[PDB]
Symmetry: C5
Subunit: 207 residues, 5 copies
C-alpha cells in the first residue's frame, strides 16, 4: 500500500496537471467500440439508442515510472478525474450521453492509459426499413470536439466493431458494424479534424 | 508542455478572475448557428426540439500574450470553467438547455476566444401547418440574460444559418433558416438589450 | 476591470457571508411574475406546467458602497451563488422547479439587488373545464419556506401579472392573471408567514 | 448580523462536525407527516406518487448557546448541509426522492433542531381497487437506513397524518392516513431498527 | 462524541487515502442481493427494472483500531465518500443506476466494512413469456469494472437471493432467484475478471 501511495503522490507532485496535447506534443488515441445493445428505435423523432463500451488508449510521458523505484509496481487503477482524458464526443447525439460504468482508468509504468467507459447514446438515425429483410444502416462519428489532427490523432486496431458481447435477445439483430478512421474539414475551423465513424446495419429480430 | 504550463500559470496570476464586461469596458460577442436537426415537434404542448451548435467569439486584453515569450505558442485549449464566458440564453425555452459537447474553449494570443457548445433546445413553437406544403415558421431569441447593449453587444458574420450539417434523414426538412441581430427594451430594465433572432421555416419530410 | 475587481474583493472581505435576515434585521422582497406560457395540462394526475420569470428585489446594507471610492461604479453583475438570495418557494409544486436562465444578479451601490430567474413549474391544479368558454382557475402560493413575516416580508408593485411576454400561439389563452400578497398561519409555526398568491384563469385556445 | 455571524462561527469552531449518535450518546427524532397530494397511481408497474412534508425534530448539546452571550439570539436559520441531519429513508421507494423545498433547518438555543423537507415519493403500491367504494390501502415505512434503535429512536406526536393541507381537487381522496411507530428486525443486522409506518387508504375522487 | 471525533480524526490522519487493492494486497468482497421488486417490464425495448439492496462486505487493515484506546468504541457509521468502496457494477445496465438509500457505511474495529446501497436498475432482458405459466428468466452480472481476480475477488454466503422483503403485491411474482460466483475473460484484458451472476425467473402475478 505504502509504495503505491508514494508512486501516486510522486506522479501528482512531480509536475502540475498535464495541459493536454499541443502541435509540438501531439497524442494518438486508440478507439475501439464493443456494441452491447440497440435498445430503442424512435420513428416519430428519428433517434436510435445504443449501449456500448468505448475503449480508449493513449500514452503520456508524465505518467511514466520505474517499477524498481516503486516496489516492482507495473500498473495501478485511478479515478479518471485525477488524470487527463481525451474529449471524444459523438458528433450527432440528440441527448447528453449517459455513463453506465465507474470513471476509473488503468495506468501502466510506460505511461500508457486504458479507459473503457460504458455509455448509452441517443443519436440521429432514420429507422425506416428496420422491419425489412435488408434492415436499416445508421452512422455516428466519434472524435475530439476541440483538438484537430495536429493535436489529437485517432487510430483503431481493427475496422470491425466487437460484437462478442452483443445482447442475443435484443429487439434488434446486427447485420454489420464498422469503425473506420476518417479525416474531415469543418466550417468553423481551418485545421483537419479526425474521427472514427461507427456504421451499423441492423434489423428487427424475429421472436 | 513546460511553456504552455507557464503561459496558463502567468495568464491566471496576471490578474484575478475577469469580472465580466462593464459600460466602460464593453464586449462584442459574435454569434452564429449550425442547425443540425429538428428532433421533435409536440402539438399537445406547442414545444419544438432543436439540435444545433452555437459558435461564440469574443476578445479580451487580459488573455493576450506574445508567442515569442512562450515557445511560439499561438493558441491553447482550456476548460470553459477556467475562463469568463458570455451568458447567451434562449429567451423562450421550456426546458433547461441540454449540453451535448465538452465545455472546452480555444484561446488565441491576440486575446480572442472561440467556444462552440452543441445543445438541445426545447422552445415555444405552435407546429400547426408542419404537415402542409408551406410548412410552419418558428422563432427563438438568443442573448445575454443580465448584460445590456452597453455591456454586451452581439454580431453575426451572416444572416443565413449554417445548414451544411443538417441531418438529411431528419423527420423535418428546412425551408428557410435565418439569424438576425435585433435590439429590444424590457419592463425590468431601462437599457436596451440586444439579441440574435433564430427564425426557421420547416415542414414534414416525405419518406 | 481593476476598480470592479477591487470592489468585488472588498465587498467579500469586509465581512463574512450574510447570515440572512432576523427579527432584529428584517427584509422586504418585492415579487413580480411575468407569465410566458402554460405549457402542459395533465388531467390524469391534475398537474399544470408554467413557464414564467420571477423578478425578485431586496436591499442589503452589507452590499452598499460609494461609487466615488470605486471609479464611479454604480452597479455590477455577479453570480447569485456569491450573494445571499431569498428562499422563495412554490408551496404546492409536484416536481423540483427547473431553472431556465443563468443564475446572475444585479447589485447597485445603495445595496439593492435584482434577480430575475426564468423557471418551469409543475404544480397542483385540476384542469376540468379548460375546454369550456369560462375556462379553469388555478392558484399557486410563493413565499419563503423558513422565514416568517418578522424576518421576510413580501410586496408587489401591481396586483396584475405581466402578460406582455405571454406566448401568443400557446395551447392555452389567459383570461386573467393575478399576484396578491397574503398573510397566513401554519400548524408548525406561531409566527405569520407571508406569500404572493398567483391566480391564473385560462382556457384552451381555438386555432 | 454581527452577533449571528459570531454565534454561527463559534458553533462551527467549538468542536469538529458532530459524528452522529452512538449507543453511548443516543438520539430521538420526532417525525410527522403532512400529506399534500396523491399525484399519480400507476397500475402497469404498481407505483404510487405522493407529495408530502416531513417534519423532523431532534436536540443536540453541541448546538446549545446562551442568548445573553449572543445579543439575545434565541434561534437561527441555517443550511441543512451545515448541520448533522438524520438518514430518515423510505424503505420501499422505487425512485430517488425529489426534494421540493429549500434545505434549511431552524436551530434553537436549547440545541433543538426542526427541519421540514417537502418531497415527492414514488413507492411500491398495488392500486387495484382505487376506483371502488372501499378504495385501496398502501403503506411505506420511514426510518434510519444505518442507525438501530440504540442509536436513533423515533417518536410521533400524533398517530394521525396532517390532512389539513391535502389538495382538495386531487384525483384521489383520503379515506384514512396514519403514522405509527414500530420496531423491526432485519436479515443483515442483529439490533432492532425502528420506523414510522405511513398507512394511507384512498380512492378515486368523483367530479 | 469526543472519542469518536478523535478516532475518525486519527483514522484519516494516520495514513493518506487507501489506493485500492493490488496484486500484492488483494481484497475479497462478499455480495448479497435482497430483491425487493420487479417494477417494470418493457417489451418494446427489452428492458426490465429491479429494486434491490446490494449488501457489500470487505476488511481493511487501515481501518483497524483498539476499542480500549478509543472509549470502548467497537464500530461507527460514516459517509461512504470518506472511505474506499469497491466499484461493483452491473455489466449489462441500459441506464445509470439510481441510488435510493443514503451513502453511509458501518466500519468495525477489526477493519471490516458493511455497506448496503438500495438501487433501481434498468437492464437488458427480453420479457417474452412473462405472461406464461413457466414465466421468463433474465440474468445480470455484477462485478468490479477495473479490478481483475488478482485484485478483487468476490464471494457469496448463499447462492439464494433474499426474497423475504420482496413486495407481495408487485406486478411480477418470483419463481426463482439465484446469485452465483463466476470467473470470465474479456476482449480488452488478459487477467480473469470475477462476477456474481443474478439470475431471476419471474412471471405476471394474477390479481
Ligand atoms: C473510556 C472508558 O470509559 N473506558 C472503559 C473503562 O472505564 C473500563 O475499565 C471498562 C469496563 O467495563 O470499559 C472500558
Ligand atoms: C463547427 C460546426 O459547424 O459544426 C460541427 C459539429 N459537426 C461535427 C456535427 C458537423
Ligand atoms: C473547434 C471546436 O470547438 O469544435 C467543433 C466541433 N467539430 C470538432 C467537429 C468541428
Ligand atoms: C437583467 C435580467 O435578469 O433580465 C430579464 C429579461 N431579459 C432577459 C431580456 C433582459
Ligand atoms: C421585464 C422582464 O422580466 O423580462 C422578460 C423578457 N423575456 C420573456 C423575453 C425574457
Ligand atoms: C418553518 C419551516 O421549516 O417550514 C414549514 C412550511 N411553511 C412555512 C412554508 C408554511
Ligand atoms: C409543517 C407544516 O404545517 O407545513 C405545511 C406546508 N404547506 C401548507 C406549505 C403546504
Ligand atoms: C439487508 C437489507 O436491506 O434488508 C431489508 C431492508 N428493507 C425492507 C428496507 C428492504
Ligand atoms: C444496516 C444498513 O446499512 O442497511 C439496512 C436497511 N434497514 C434500514 C431496514 C435495516
Ligand atoms: C478492465 C476495465 O478497465 O474495464 C472493462 C469492462 N470489464 C471489466 C467487465 C471487462
Ligand atoms: C472492451 C471489452 O471487451 O469489454 C466488455 C464488458 N461487457 C461484456 C460487460 C459488456
Ligand atoms: Cl459574470
Ligand atoms: Cl484540456
Ligand atoms: Cl440562509
Ligand atoms: Cl453521519
Ligand atoms: Cl481506486
Amino acid at each position: 500500500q505504502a509504495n503505491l501511495m508514494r508512486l501516486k503522490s510522486d506522479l501528482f507532485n512531480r509536475s502540475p496537471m498535464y495541459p493536454g496535447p499541443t502541435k509540438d506534443d501531439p497524442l494518438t488515441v486508440t478507439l475501439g467500440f464493443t456494441l452491447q445493445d440497440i435498445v430503442k428505435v424512435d420513428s416519430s423523432t428519428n433517434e436510435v439508442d445504443l449501449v456500448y463500451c468505448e475503449q480508449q488508449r493513449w500514452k503520456l510521458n508524465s505518467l511514466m515510472w520505474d517499477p524498481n523505484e516503486y516496489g516492482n509496481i507495473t500498473d495501478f487503477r485511478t479515478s479518471a478525474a485525477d488524470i487527463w482524458t481525451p474529449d471524444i464526443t459523438a458528433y450527432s447525439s440528440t441527448r447528453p450521453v449517459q455513463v453506465l460504468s465507474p470513471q476509473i482508468a488503468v495506468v501502466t509504468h510506460d505511461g500508457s492509459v486504458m479507459f473503457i467507459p460504458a455509455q448509452r447514446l441517443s443519436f440521429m438515425c432514420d429507422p425506416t426499413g428496420v422491419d425489412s429483410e435488408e434492415g436499416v444502416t445508421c452512422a455516428v462519428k466519434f472524435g475530439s470536439w476541440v483538438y484537430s489532427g495536429f493535436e489529437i490523432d485517432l487510430k483503431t486496431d481493427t475496422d470491425q466493431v466487437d460484437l462478442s458481447s452483443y445482447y442475443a435477445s435484443s429487439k434488434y439483430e446486427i447485420l454489420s458494424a464498422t469503425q473506420t478512421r476518417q479525416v474531415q474539414h469543418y466550417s468553423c475551423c481551418p485545421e483537419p479534424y479526425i474521427d472514427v465513424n461507427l456504421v451499423v446495419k441492423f434489423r428487427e429480430r424475429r421472436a
